[PDB]
């Protein structure tokens, strides 16, 4: 759970040192960002269902073969559609966690770590999740610091997937 606060503590502990003004300034930046991060999380939470549903249709529209061909890794049936909605919901919920935390730590340990072999083992195309994340960027309706921080997390996920 990489955040400004845990890294400041980790940096000080790796040197066996107390918390100097450097760590305090790290915390001040975290405090400056935190209110925007929390408000971004609330806005994404209240609009989570529509964002997830819209993201599934954007992935379905861009990749129609996912709703047509049979296979465990595709969404031709209701089972695959539910799995896809659940995955996009996982991505959206963990982004809100990152907005709350102030770092990529929630994405890092809940989703990003090991996602490569997750996609490879179950034959899930990462471009699907990239387009879902792109839709979330285009439709989350955020502005200012909240938008910048949320888009940073979303592009972190997109970069890890591509």
């Amino acid at each position: 759970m990489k955040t400004p606060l845990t890294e400041a503590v980790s940096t000080a502990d790796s040197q066996g040192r107390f918390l100097s003004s450097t760590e305090l300034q790290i915390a001040f930046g975290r405090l400056r960002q935190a209110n925007a991060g929390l408000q971004a999380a609330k806005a994404l939470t209240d609009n989570a269902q529509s964002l997830v549903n819209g993201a599934a249709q954007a992935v379905y529209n861009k990749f129609p073969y996912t709703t047509q061909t049979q296979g465990n890794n595709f969404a031709a049936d209701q089972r695959g559609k539910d799995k896809c909605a659940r995955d996009i919901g996982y991505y959206l919920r963990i982004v809100t966690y990152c907005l709350v935390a102030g770092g990529t730590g929630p994405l890092d340990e809940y989703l990003i770590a090991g996602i490569d072999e997750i996609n490879r083992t179950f034959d899930l195309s990462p471009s699907w999740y990239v387009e879902a994340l792109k839709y979330i960027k285009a439709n989350h309706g955020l502005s200012g610091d909240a938008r910048d921080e949320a888009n940073s997390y979303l592009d972190y996920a997109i970069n890890a997937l591509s």
């Binding site: 890294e7 503590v9 980790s10 790796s14 040197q15 890092d108 340990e109 770590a113 072999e117």
Partner: protein, 194 residues
């Protein structure tokens, strides 16, 4: 004489962890980064922390630090110099049995816990047969050390914390203090209070 064969045990380090850099990833103190004098101090203190837990200025080796600063020796050579130092022999070798010296050597050179009592038993004869420096050099030239820390990186406790868990394994400086109950009763401790 060849080392006794001992079976491995399931450990975090023996298995692929799919690690993403975070606050629980140990800091890579490497001379490959062309370190300034203060960053070099941080690297040196990390090695003291890895090897001696804490190094009082009586325990410091200023000549070894100067050689490491100048590039005379590698980080692994500096680690070797710490293990061959008077501090390490007095604190960790002298006050412990050979078996509890292999632990305190596996833990802080290889950065992993001992597999079993058999590994401690197998490696404890090396001090008395090949010499003290023989044990230090066998562990430092081992594939485990070189593949993990190489020549330029200070060793560390590997894979202590799994992602998502609040607490990982005990840090080796907590798990294994310099001496055990054996030297404790030789010293006459524990003391009764009041």
């Amino acid at each position: 004489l060849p080392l006794l064969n001992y079976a491995p045990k399931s450990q975090n380090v023996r298995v692929e962890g799919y690690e993403i850099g975070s606050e629980e990833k140990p800091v890579v103190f490497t001379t490959e980064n062309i370190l300034s004098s203060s960053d070099m101090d941080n690297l040196i203190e990390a090695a003291y922390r890895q090897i001696f837990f804490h190094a009082f200025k009586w325990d410091r080796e200023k000549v070894l630090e100067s050689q490491l600063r100048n590039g005379q020796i590698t980080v692994r050579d500096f680690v070797r110099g710490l293990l061959l130092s008077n501090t390490f022999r007095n604190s960790f070798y002298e006050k412990n049995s050979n078996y509890r010296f292999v632990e305190h050597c596996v833990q802080k050179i290889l950065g992993r816990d001992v597999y079993s009592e058999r590994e401690k038993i197998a490696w404890s004869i090396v001090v008395a047969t090949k010499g003290y420096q023989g044990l230090i050099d066998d562990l430092l030239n081992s594939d485990e050390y070189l593949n993990n820390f190489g020549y330029d990186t200070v060793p560390y406790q590997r894979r202590r914390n799994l992602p998502g868990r609040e607490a990982g394994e005990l840090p080796f400086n907590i798990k294994s203090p310099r001496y055990d109950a054996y030297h404790r009763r030789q010293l006459g401790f524990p003391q009764i209070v009041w």
